[PDB]
Design an enzyme around this catalytic site. Structure first.
Site, PDB file in Angstrom:
ATOM      1  N   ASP B 282       0.807  -1.218   0.000  1.00  0.00           N
ATOM      2  CA  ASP B 282       0.000   0.000   0.000  1.00  0.00           C
ATOM      3  C   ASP B 282       0.842   1.271   0.000  1.00  0.00           C
ATOM      4  OD1 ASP B 282       0.842  -0.536   2.600  1.00  0.00           O
ATOM      5  OD2 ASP B 282      -1.130  -0.282   3.517  1.00  0.00           O
ATOM      6  N   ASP B 306       0.155  -7.244 -10.528  1.00  0.00           N
ATOM      7  CA  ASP B 306      -0.899  -6.799 -11.432  1.00  0.00           C
ATOM      8  C   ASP B 306      -1.208  -5.334 -11.172  1.00  0.00           C
ATOM      9  OD1 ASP B 306      -4.482  -7.205 -11.411  1.00  0.00           O
ATOM     10  OD2 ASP B 306      -3.228  -6.601 -13.096  1.00  0.00           O
TER      11      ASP B 306
HETATM   12 MG   LIG Z   1      -2.416   1.795   5.955  1.00  0.00          MG
HETATM   13 MG   LIG Z   2      -4.301  -6.637 -16.602  1.00  0.00          MG
END
Ligand SMILES: [Mg+2]
Ligand SMILES: [Mg+2]
Lengths: 415, 415
Positions: B282, B306
């Site tokens: 993240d 991805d």
């Molecule tokens: Mg966080």
């Molecule tokens: Mg893709």
């Protein structure tokens, strides 16, 4: 034994028929938060007090009550008490609370305290509103086009913490069951393999999306986008998407747009047709940069919400000022979204924008909209005055460097 | 029965001791790809042929051989043949192949064809190099700071496709086992719950990271960053991180930097110390915007790869020109990364940049570096000449709108 002292002056918020009954003197629990929580929390307390004092002209006043969690909990209650049962009891009991940055120690097999709080209090809604504040330096050309509200599912997904370590007895037991009894043949390497479980229920999905749609209606938002990776994870992410649309139809009279799959829900109060749509998660991550204006209210699962919220924050330059909230049917805990930054802890230099804006969300949640507006008004003026903290200042020219506390004052001054 | 015609002139590439033996007349299989594959593939064929013709002055020449997969496979081989066994046999047999955009139909319980190819040929490496091309319109201020190579794990993760539908017998059976025999208490709602399995093995991790490090050495890259969400998914994502560092130590003599956790691997050929580090997924999504220059070679799991690849692409304005490759120990399939865009299919207007750049990766993989360089040289000149396709043109001023085929020529002209 409790060290939590309840304010003599102050009354507890009650809940009835789904509505909070907030007295003019509510008792609001607060967790300082590890690291820079020591800097940001005091700034938050002062700005909030100023906001309410000004808004209601002394009539109302919050009676802050300190509760503990994290590093400070251990120092107060003892060696291994990172999250006391009373903290969960108190937040629940007082319905509304706020907290600073928290951290979970490694080596003791303890799992995320932040998640412990969300899951244990069933705070199934992770509300992350990401908007731009004119003046904040950003890595993108048009951050102003970003005005989104994130509705992230908080009780399920791979986040549940259901997993087993590679080579451990349980991992073997699970994999054996999968391959032998479930006929799983897609585990590339069964040996030395850690296994995780990703759950998703119709009820878990329905309550989140329901909260998202009701929000769009209440705030007259343009659309609700269901983000997911259903093309790969059909039975979890695809299911989320399916149930999301189904709910829109079943409870909000969503009608089909064109030949599908988009639906439209007429805002019962404004007559505005709210668009109910969906996008694959990986594409969304591109669409937030390429077409941010086309989006508004987002409804997604736990992990995706985490990523999406962080990505949106970074873009608008709000990595350190993104507000957040964990809402549930009985209580709600608002929180500073950023990390603890132990290196700066105590220097009075970190940006309190996150916790302060989360407190603005707190006030609004209590129906104290006038006070909330004063905080956002202050934020806008301060930021727009280029009188900011180091994190903002270092990326600007001709800006006045302010300390954490000083920025707090700047916000107050701009109310 | 086969409709695949092998070129009379042309020789098959062989593999020995881990090295490909590529003749001057290699037979290269190609899958047109659904939708716009009908437009991009022809452009790719022409530019590649031009590149090799120029580079080796007629000495070498690729003998393209069409194989089928997707919508076209059904039209050629029949009703339900979306992926013929021979396609997997042929790619494996010829070691190197390329393909256009592919799509998987819904309603027939068929799973991702793209994933079918990767998993069935054990193409465990998803190589996604993201760099900026001067001239391409981008949503960010400094896209030039992006020069990263993505090493995404292709055989495991939640991507394996291991999952069961809500209310189905199997889902119940699995959940029952989890709750009763595994003592799982973290499934918020057991009823009407779809369940997915997220695997990760030490071997799967080791081969990916190993490929990433060997790449950094071979291309004298600055560092290898292990992206993961280990703080929540310890036994899967955290494990990936652990094994990544362990491999760096065990096989590349990685030494500790400061007090950890970063390691340094001395490039055996240049003496340069490559940094081996890690960041939470993240945060990475934020760091790619805020500090893109601090990163280079990335090593991550399937799903994260991805997302990360898509995010990076969008930033540099390469959503439609990002190259990609699926590499394994016996064969490799290069591919157009974008979608099929059926609406524009046949209009000769889509950007062939993705497939063409993936072909450049193909040539380089074959040791035909001179030809590869000619393609990137052409791309840079064409793009930099503002003589581009609609997708680029619509975001620029004073640019010359070109057709798909015309852009192909532009690239050739700039070689
Ligand atoms: Mg966080
Ligand atoms: Mg893709």
């Amino acid at each position: 034994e409790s060290k939590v002292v309840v304010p003599a002056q102050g009354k507890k918020i009650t809940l009835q028929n789904g509505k909070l009954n907030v007295p003019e003197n509510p008792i609001i629990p607060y967790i300082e938060g590890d690291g820079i929580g020591v800097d940001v929390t005091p700034a938050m307390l002062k700005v909030v007090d100023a906001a309410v004092e000004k808004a209601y002209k002394g009539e109302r006043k919050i009676s802050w009550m300190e509760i503990y969690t994290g590093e400070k909990s251990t120092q107060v209650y003892g060696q291994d008490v990172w999250l006391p049962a009373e903290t969960l009891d108190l937040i629940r009991e007082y319905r509304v609370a706020i907290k600073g940055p928290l951290t979970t120690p490694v080596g003791g097999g303890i799992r995320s305290l932040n998640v412990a709080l969300r899951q244990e209090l069933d705070l199934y809604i992770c509300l992350r509103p990401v908007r731009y504040y004119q003046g904040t330096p950003s890595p993108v050309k048009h951050p102003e086009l970003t005005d989104m509200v994130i509705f992230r599912e908080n009780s399920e997904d791979i986040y549940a913490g259901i997993e087993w370590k590679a080579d451990s007895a349980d991992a073997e037991k699970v994999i054996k069951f999968l391959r032998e009894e479930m006929g799983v043949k897609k585990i590339r390497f069964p040996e030395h393999c850690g296994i995780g479980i990703k759950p998703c229920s119709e009820e878990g999905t329905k309550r989140l999306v329901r909260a998202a749609i009701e929000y769009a209606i209440a705030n007259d938002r343009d659309s609700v986008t269901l983000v997911h990776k259903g093309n790969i994870m059909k039975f979890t992410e695809g299911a989320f998407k399916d149930w999301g649309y189904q709910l829109a139809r079943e409870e909000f009279g969503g009608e089909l747009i064109d030949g599908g799959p988009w639906l439209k829900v007429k805002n019962p109060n404004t007559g505005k047709e709210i668009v109910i749509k969906d996008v694959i998660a990986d594409a969304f991550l591109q669409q937030i940069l390429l077409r941010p204006a086309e989006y508004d209210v987002i409804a997604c699962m736990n992990l995706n919400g985490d990523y999406i919220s962080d990505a949106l924050a970074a873009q608008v330059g709000g990595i350190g000022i993104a507000p957040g909230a964990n809402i549930g049917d009985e209580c709600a805990l608002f929180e500073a979204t950023h990390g603890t930054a132990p290196a700066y802890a105590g220097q009075d230099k970190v940006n309190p924008g996150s916790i302060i804006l989360s407190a603005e969300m707190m006030l609004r949640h209590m129906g104290w909209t006038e006070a909330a507006d004063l905080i956002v008004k202050g934020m806008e003026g301060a930021i727009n005055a280029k009188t900011v903290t180091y994190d903002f200042e270092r990326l600007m020219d001709g800006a006045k460097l302010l300390k954490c506390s000083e920025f707090g004052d700047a916000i107050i001054e701009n109310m």
